[PDB]
Design a protein around this ligand. Structure first.
Ligand code: A1A9V
Ligand code: CL
Length: 167
């Protein structure tokens, strides 16, 4: 039993809700919130910009030190950093950005990072401003993640479209 509320159950392990991931994380304080990151951990917009804003830029400050030490992430890769005031940990995961010409096949590799954590609050990777098809992102999530994932979908029409089209 966990403290996630109001989710629709899609499979044995994948749950979905229409919600702002920032507000969800503040309420639940999950062990892990997933950020839709880029390789430079520059949290400018989308989920990343919103999560960073909610930390009063502390996420960005921590991220800049991470990059200065380690260099950029790989597309499809991840790192674990602090969750600040939102969660215990933030798993920064880089899905391919179609608006940069990155290979969509890397979306499966990106979701594989979730399997290192028993329970996660997450967005749909490569959706939104990353330019991929969200129906596809959900399909890959369900077919790749085996741990318990609580998906927060920002947009209501998308959420309803995602639920109504789910196989
Ligand atoms: O897939 C990621 C989605 C993309 N979404 C954005 C709205 C329009 C349709 C596409 N972004 C978010 N998902 C959950 N919480 C969020 N907080 C801020 C952004 C955000
Ligand atoms: Cl977005």
């Amino acid at each position: 039993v966990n403290s996630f509320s109001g989710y629709l159950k899609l499979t044995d392990n994948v749950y979905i809700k229409n919600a702002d991931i920032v507000e969800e994380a503040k309420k639940v304080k999950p062990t892990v919130v997933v950020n839709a990151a880029n390789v430079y951990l520059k949290h400018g917009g989308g989920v990343a910009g919103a999560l960073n804003k909610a930390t009063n830029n502390a996420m960005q400050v921590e991220s800049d030190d991470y990059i200065a030490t380690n260099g950029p992430l790989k597309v499809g890769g991840s790192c674990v950093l602090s969750g600040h005031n939102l969660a215990k940990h933030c798993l920064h995961v880089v899905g391919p950005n179609v608006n940069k010409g990155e290979d969509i096949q890397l979306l499966k590799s990106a979701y594989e990072n979730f399997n290192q954590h028993e329970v996660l609050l997450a967005p749909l990777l490569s959706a939104g401003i990353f330019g991929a098809d969200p129906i596809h992102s959900l399909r890959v999530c369900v077919d790749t993640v085996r741990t318990n994932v609580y998906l927060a979908v920002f947009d209501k029409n998308l959420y309803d479209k995602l639920v109504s089209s789910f196989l």
